[PDB]
Amino acid sequence: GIHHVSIKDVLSKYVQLLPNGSSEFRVVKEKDGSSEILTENQVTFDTKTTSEGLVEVTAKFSPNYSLEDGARYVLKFTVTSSQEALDAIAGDKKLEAGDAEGSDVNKLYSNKGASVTYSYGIGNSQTKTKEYSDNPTFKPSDPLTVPVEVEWQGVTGARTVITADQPSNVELKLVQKNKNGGSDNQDYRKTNVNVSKNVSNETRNFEKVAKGYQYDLIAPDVPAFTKEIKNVGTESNPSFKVIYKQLPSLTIKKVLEAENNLNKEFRIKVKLTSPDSKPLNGTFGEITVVNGEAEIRVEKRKRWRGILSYLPRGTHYKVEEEAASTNGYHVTYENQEGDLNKDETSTVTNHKLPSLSVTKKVTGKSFKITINIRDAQNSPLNGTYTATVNNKRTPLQFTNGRASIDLNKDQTIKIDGLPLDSHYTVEEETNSSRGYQVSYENQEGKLDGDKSATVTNNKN
């Protein structure tokens, strides 16, 4: 028989053993149909690293085990594709001479030499080595194709109309995360996805992506939109979705009411605070916000409006007109305060304050007339208002609802800036009236705009 037998394979760098000898080395003796597994006492397995850093596998038969005549002994074990082969088939490594049959990546050689050593003879036996002449090959599994999808959403979610500018495409990059120290490859594969107005979903795929790595995606920052990237597949079979969701915008509008001067400008402050109770800073369209404060100056030329474009989602707003800008107006607000989770319009209404005019007519000497005014809430007026008698602006003061004025024939006094929706009555004092018949135009009335009352004194 032959003895001192041993079988040797040097694996090429394109394959490798499995963890924990899951590789299951065994030698099977095959003879007359029947298959039998050599025991620990008949064969031993050694893995070693050669000087060139290749893995060598040896099945050493128990030295005095003699091969039974005509029996086929077969070493068997599993290998798996190494990273080298997974990269090679993905196209990421070039083959050198000697790597694969005719440099075909589908026919990588598994071995860098294999042989059997054996002795024969009693006494000083003789030793031969025969190299195996078969040089087998294999194809690694196909590399991955990794889909990527882009979804655009309007402010209020999926398939809602988008109003913001979009670029005409986005460059997406697949990042192969480095495992063995080193840096991530951020340009591993790239694709340009089309972007068309009102096409909300669009797909491409990275081709020829090597298995063995974790992947991530890079997608550009697009102004006016927030960005979410998710792997909707798995670690080993990645598939990515990028969602761009438009950010909300706050429109500040001014409305003039009962105001025939359209050439005034108004200053409107907006206070903007973050969900994390914090200083909001930055520029949103034309408006810069410094430490939560922003100021919008409105006029006819800017269509009585300003827009803070594309504020953080959830931003808290409180709009208020500057004190100076409110003089001469009853100022009311719609949507003054809120949280910005969709587009919002906040409206400042400046309603010009009403005046009262009183006129003395004489038919058929100063005349004293008492004005009584109660405010909208029906409490008597206290305060001083500008009053005009032929271009002479004198202050007129109301105490507890009453003021009193002195008119000559054909004089008008005009009292400005009175409170909106208050009620006046006028009455001549009975001493002024002595001798004359007094009647009134518009003696009582509601200050919902500029009003006129007339006192006519007829002699007799």
């Binding site: 394979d9 005509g70 086929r72 002994y73 598994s110 025969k130 090959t137 294999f138 690694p140 599994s141």
Partner: peptide, 30 residues
Amino acid sequence: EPQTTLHKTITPISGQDDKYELSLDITSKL
């Protein structure tokens, strides 16, 4: 010396990605 024959093959392992069975044999004959 007896005659020896030697055969080495690799086989894809059915239904598994990237696994292959190596088979190195020896037969001795008188």
